[PDB]
Each structure stands twice: as structure tokens, then as C-alpha cells.
């Protein structure tokens, strides 16, 4: 359940801060690829018109990152109801060094569980679109290398601002 | 003659899944499904297990959870005997 | 051909056909071919029927029905003819026959086989199993 999930007072600030950090890393990834400035998106000119901060956009420019950043937190609140701030906070948009603190014994299992839940929501979204299909545990190495990059950045975005959600021979 | 298909990785993988998708059908008789199971048994041999891991991926979701199933278990036993001479 | 069957399957098949025939014409519908096979114990699913009418209009006459049972009986008999053909080769019956036993009983079977043909036969293949002998006969 993600649409029928309540958002806390820190979740309203986490939805825009995760969308701002996703735009800041994407503008940092496109600045090295010689992406010029354009009014509309073109693949030939490498134009990007949304090269700005998230606090200077309007309601017509933030709808592509509203539901995608709020459903991931609502699925995280439904898996473990811990949404509070317990630590301090942490175009040429330079993103901060999110690889400062390594993943501990709790964060390494929290990153894989959020990766499996996002794959379960995307597989249900593909099943509802097909009626109107791979598991995360048995996925291929080439597909799991790129799908875990979205889970590692989201856990690095949630680790800032104090919103740290924390829940073969021997067996044979 | 299928030994050494390091040229193309998606054609032999897309063929090996559609034959297994054709191996289970309601409008098929026993004489044709015995050909497809013999065709799938021959093509799981004479090829490297790098491309067979994607079909060993798909069968282990559906065949070992319940005891179509005889040809699938025999192809899995032949692949395991071949590898004896992620995927783990 | 149709001489693979005895008299007594054919008299049984006309017994089943004339029982459920419409007016004595020798006609049945595409339903009645199903009920005439389940009346004798044989219970095929509908794919086994689905190919035989494609192999023969909606009118299934008695020579068409006799040829379909002949192909339905010969395929299992041609798969099982060769094990009982293997039974006089070995004394116990599990499938293990001696190599010294096989050169006087296979040269004397009545197809005018000389000493040379069975000498070619066994060295293009101690005791050998039963499933290898089908592998070496059908080739």
C-alpha cells in the first residue's frame, strides 16, 4: 500500500529534497557530456531546459518528479513506519559527497529491501499495464547493476536530513 | 554446429525461450511435443552455459515448485551433468 | 495397410460403428466420433480427434474411421513390437543376452541371413543391454 499511506511532516520536505538532489546529480552528469542550453529537449543538440533549482520551478515543471519521489517514501513508510529526523542536514549544480558514511549492517539490508519493493511495484505496474516480469532476487547481473543505482542514490538521499529509516553448505 | 555462438547473444537466447514457450500448449498432441522436447534437449547441449543461465533462470521459478515437467527436469539434469564436468 | 489388424478388432469396430450410425448409411457427426471411442475404453483428448478429421466435410464414413483406428493402434504396436522380439534372445528377460548365444539363433531365423551379415551386425554396435539393441536396430 502506497496510495493509502500517510506522509509525515518530514515527508513533505523529503519529497522536494529528493527531487532537488535528483535534478542536481542529473545536471552534474549532463554537464560533462557537453549538453548545451535549449528551450525544448533535442537529442541532437543535447538540450536540457530544466537546468535550474527545484525552488525556482512551478507546478507545471515539478509534476514529473512529484509522484515518483512520493511513492518511494510511501512504500518505505509502509514497510517500516519510521519517518523522523534524528540527525543534521547533509546551471552548475554540484552535488555533495553522499559516499561519506558507508552502509552498515542495517543500511545494507534496508537498501536491498527498498530495491526489491521498487521492483515489486514496477512489476505490478507492468502487470496492470499489460492486462489493460522478473524478480529482483533472480534478476541478471547486467540488469541488477543499473537497477541498484537508483536504490543506492535514494538511500544516500534519505540518509541526509536525519531521515534514516532503520527497521550454502552449512544450510545443506 | 551451434558450438561457438559468441557472435550473437540475444538471438540464441530469444530462440531458446520461444521453443520452451512452444513446449507447453493445449492444442498440441504427444507426437509434436516429443519432437520439441527432443529439440530442446539437443539445443541445450553443444552450447556454453553462459546463454543457458537465462533459461535456467526462467525454469527454476516454475518447474521445481511443483512435482511439460518431465522434459523440463530432464533438460535441467542434463545441464547440471554438463556443468559438473547468480547461477549458484 | 489395414492387414495389421486381425478380424476381431475389425468386427468390434463395425460393432461400435453400426451401433451409433445414423440411418445405416455409415455416417456419424464430429461429435459421434468422440463418443464412439470413449465407448471402448480409449479416452483421447480433443487434440487427438482434431488432427484426424483434418487428415481425412463433416461426414466420417466407415473406411475413414477404420483407417484412423489402424493408425491409432499401429504406432503403439510399432513402438512395442521390438521388446517381445528381444525376449527369445535372453533367457531371463531383463535384457541381458550373451554374445556367444547370439550367433546361432540369429543366423537361423529364416530371412536367409548368412554368417557374414550378423558378423557385420554385432561389430558395428560380455552382454549388452536392451535399449542399445533398439539403438542398433533402427539406426
Helix residue ranges per DSSP H, A4-82: 9-31, 67-79
Deposited resolution, Å: 3.8
And the C-alpha cell for C66? Answer: 477404420
* Chain B residues closer than 8 Å to A141 by CB: 86
Q: What is the C-alpha separation between B54 and B74, in angstroms, rounded?
A: 17
Question: A34-48 burial by CB neighbour count: b if 16+ within 10 A, else e?
Answer: eeeeeeeeeeeeeeb
Q: Determination method here?
A: cryo-EM
> Which letter does DSSP use for residue A56 in this model?
G
Closest CA to C17 of C3, C32, C30: C32
C-beta of residue A93 within 8 angstroms of C-beta of residue A26: no
Give CA–CA dist C139/C137, Å, rounded.
5
Kindly state the cell numbers that stand for C41: 475404453
Phi, psi of B11 (to 5 degrees): -75, -45
Binding-site residues on chain B for chain A (CB distance < 8 A): 54, 57, 60-61, 86, 88
Indicate the DSSP class of residue A37. Answer: B
Contacts of B32 in chain C (CB under 8 A): none
Structure-block grid coordinates of residue B65: 515448485
**Rounded-to-5 percentages of helix, strand, coil across chain A:** 50, 0, 50
Chain A positions touching B60 (Cβ under 8 A) are: 138
Touching partners of C (3+ C-beta pairs < 8 Å): B
Indicate left, alpha or beta for B47 from its phi (over 0: left) and psi (-120 to 50: alpha): beta
> Which residue, chain included where needed, has cell 489395414?
C2
The grid coordinates of residue B59 equal 525454469
- Residue B61: closest CA among chain A residues belongs to which residue? A138
Look at A140 and B61 and tell me if their CB atoms are within 8 Å: no
Residue C44's closest chain B neighbor by CA? B29
Separation of alpha carbons B37 and A116, rounded Å:
35
Q: How many helices (DSSP H) and strands (DSSP E) are in chain A? A: 4, 0
Q: Is C42 on the interface with B (CB under 8 A)?
A: no
- The answer to whether the Cβ–Cβ distance between A138 and B54 falls below 8 Å is no
Q: How many CB atoms lie within 10 A of CB C15?
A: 10
The most distant pair of C-alpha atoms in chain C lies apart, rounded to whole Å, by: 64
CA proximity to C25, closest of C63, C53, C55? C63
Amino acid at each position: 500500500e502506497t496510495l493509502n499511506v500517510i506522509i509525515p511532516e518530514k515527508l513533505d520536505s523529503f519529497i522536494n529534497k529528493f527531487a532537488e538532489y535528483t535534478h542536481e546529480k542529473w545536471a552534474f552528469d549532463k554537464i560533462q557530456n557537453n549538453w548545451s542550453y535549449g528551450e525544448n529537449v533535442d537529442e541532437e543538440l543535447k538540450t536540457h531546459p530544466m537546468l535550474r533549482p527545484y525552488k525556482t520551478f512551478s507546478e507545471k515543471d515539478k509534476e514529473i518528479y512529484r509522484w515518483p519521489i512520493k511513492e518511494s517514501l510511501k512504500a518505505m513508510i509502509a514497510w517500516e513506519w519510521t519517518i523522523e529526523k534524528a540527525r543534521e542536514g547533509e546551471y552548475n549544480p554540484q552535488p555533495p559527497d553522499l559516499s561519506g558514511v558507508t552502509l552498515s549492517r542495517e543500511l545494507q539490508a534496508m537498501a536491498e529491501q527498498l530495491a526489491e519493493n521498487y521492483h515489486n511495484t514496477w512489476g505490478r505496474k507492468k502487470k496492470q499495464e499489460l492486462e489493460a516480469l522478473v524478480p529482483y532476487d533472480t534478476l541478471t547481473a547486467k540488469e541488477k547493476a543499473r537497477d541498484r543505482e537508483k536504490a543506492q542514490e535514494l538511500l544516500k538521499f534519505l540518509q541526509m536530513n536525519g531521515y534514516a529509516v532503520t527497521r550454502x553448505x552449512x544450510x545443506x | 554446429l551451434f558450438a561457438g555462438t559468441e557472435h550473437r547473444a540475444i538471438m540464441v537466447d530469444s530462440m531458446l525461450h520461444t521453443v520452451y514457450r512452444l513446449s507447453r500448449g493445449r492444442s498440441l498432441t504427444k507426437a509434436q511435443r516429443d519432437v520439441i522436447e527432443d529439440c530442446l534437449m539437443a539445443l541445450c547441449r553443444y552450447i556454453r552455459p553462459s546463454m543457458l543461465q537465462h533459461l535456467l533462470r526462467r525454469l527454476v521459478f516454475d518447474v521445481p515448485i511443483l512435482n511439460x515437467x518431465x522434459x523440463x527436469x530432464x533438460x535441467x539434469x542434463x545441464x547440471x551433468x554438463x556443468x559438473x564436468x547468480x547461477x549458484x | 495397410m489395414a492387414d495389421q489388424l486381425t478380424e476381431e478388432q475389425i468386427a468390434e469396430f463395425k460393432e461400435a460403428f453400426s451401433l451409433f450410425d445414423k440411418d445405416g448409411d455409415g455416417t456419424i457427426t464430429t461429435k459421434a466420433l468422440g463418443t464412439v471411442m470413449r465407448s471402448l475404453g480409449q479416452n483421447p483428448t480433443e487434440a487427438e480427434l482434431q488432427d484426424m478429421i483434418n487428415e481425412v466435410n463433416g461426414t466420417i464414413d466407415f473406411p475413414a474411421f477404420l483407417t484412423m483406428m489402424a493408425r491409432k493402434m499401429k504406432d503403439t504396436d510399432s513402438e512395442e513390437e521390438i521388446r517381445e522380439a528381444f525376449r527369445v534372445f535372453d533367457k531371463d528377460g531383463n535384457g541381458y543376452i550373451s554374445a556367444a548365444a547370439l550367433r546361432h539363433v540369429m543366423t537361423n531365423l529364416g530371412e536367409k541371413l548368412t554368417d557374414e551379415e550378423v558378423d557385420e551386425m554385432i561389430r558395428e554396435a560380455g552382454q549388452v543391454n536392451y535399449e542399445a539393441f533398439v539403438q542398433m536396430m533402427t539406426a
